[PDB]
């Protein structure tokens, strides 16, 4: 909303960065991308928000 | 037949029993007016009820307080509380209620525990400490 004021143009969608991050498992765990589950849970491969 | 309303107010272990008789009414603690007692920095402290409600408001009310127990400072919110409570029971029981309520308002808009007994009293000591809570210093290697 700073930028949408100062815009010379009207409305304007703004772009997006499309980064494909891409971690080794070490950093995936250390930096909390995944975690570490129970034996029954290890299997449940769905991706749940 | 005059008034004879006795009322007490306390602080810690300082029971102060005030009592209000009808008369000219110039007020006194044990046997000496409010102008002394002489923790003194306080003084206004115990005058307060007078100074709030009006010098008129005890103008038909000889009050005599008595104080034992507790301590120097305590003895004063004890006698303050007493001559505000007693004076309250005065205008209530025989006189009216509106003035009782105009009093009780004038007081309880700033309490200082005037009609309210301070519910507090000291904690006991527990073994392994100088006071209630604090503890004899831990040796440690």
């Amino acid at each position: 909303r700073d930028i949408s004021e100062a815009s010379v143009f009207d409305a304007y969608v703004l772009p997006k960065l499309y980064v494909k991050l891409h971690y080794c498992v070490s950093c995936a765990i250390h930096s909390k991308v995944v975690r570490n589950r129970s034996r029954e849970a290890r299997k449940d491969r769905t991706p749940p928000p | 037949p005059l008034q004879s309303v006795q009322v007490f107010g306390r602080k810690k272990t300082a029971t102060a029993v005030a009592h209000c008789k009808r008369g000219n009414g110039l007020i006194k603690v044990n046997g000496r007016p409010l102008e002394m007692i002489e923790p003194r920095t306080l003084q206004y402290k115990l005058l307060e009820p007078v100074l709030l409600l009006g010098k008129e408001r005890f103008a038909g009310v000889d009050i005599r307080v008595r104080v034992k127990g507790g301590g120097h400072v305590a003895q004063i919110y004890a006698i303050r509380q007493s001559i505000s409570k007693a004076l309250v029971a005065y205008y209530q029981k025989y006189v009216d209620e509106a003035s009782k309520k105009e009093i009780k308002d004038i007081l309880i808009q700033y309490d200082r525990t005037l009609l309210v007994a301070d519910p507090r009293r000291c904690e006991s000591k527990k073994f392994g400490g100088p006071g209630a809570r604090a503890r004899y210093q831990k040796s440690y290697r």
């Binding site: - | 044990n30 046997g31 000496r32 007016p33 102008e35 002394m36 002489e38």
Partner: protein
């Protein structure tokens, strides 16, 4: 305007004056070399305690119906550094409170009560609080 009605600390100021300006009581000799109570560090500056303390002692008896030497010692107390030790309470000197009582007895401010202990006698009861009128009516201040 009794002893109470007069602001009690400028009582003994004038009662000390009384017994000085009488020019009789019976000042003695342990006097210039007196400690006052093993209690104290140091012999008192106003070289004239017992005119001002016999004042105290005598008005004190006014307030209390009976008092022994043991009582007078008790009342003039204090804390007492035994030094690096903690402070404790030590009774005042007997000798001096006693001779204060016996000396007040000479002017006949006081007498020995029944059931033990000194109280003040009607005659003394006067000299005491006569000047209470004179202390209130010295001036309002």
């Amino acid at each position: 305007v009794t002893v109470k009605d007069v602001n009690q600390q400028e009582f003994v100021r004038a009662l000390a004056a009384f017994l000085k300006k009488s020019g009789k009581l019976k000042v003695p000799e342990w006097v210039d070399t007196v400690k006052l109570a093993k209690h104290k560090e140091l012999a008192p500056y106003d070289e004239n305690w017992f005119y001002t303390r016999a004042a105290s002692t005598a008005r004190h008896l006014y307030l209390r119906g009976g008092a022994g030497v043991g009582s007078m010692t008790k009342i003039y107390g204090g804390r007492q550094r035994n030094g690096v030790m903690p402070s404790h309470f030590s009774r005042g000197s007997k000798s001096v409170a006693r001779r204060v009582l016996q000396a007040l007895e000479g002017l006949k401010m006081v007498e020995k009560d029944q059931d033990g202990g000194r109280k003040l006698t009607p005659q003394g009861q006067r000299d005491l609080d006569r000047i209470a009128g004179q202390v209130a009516a010295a001036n309002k201040k």
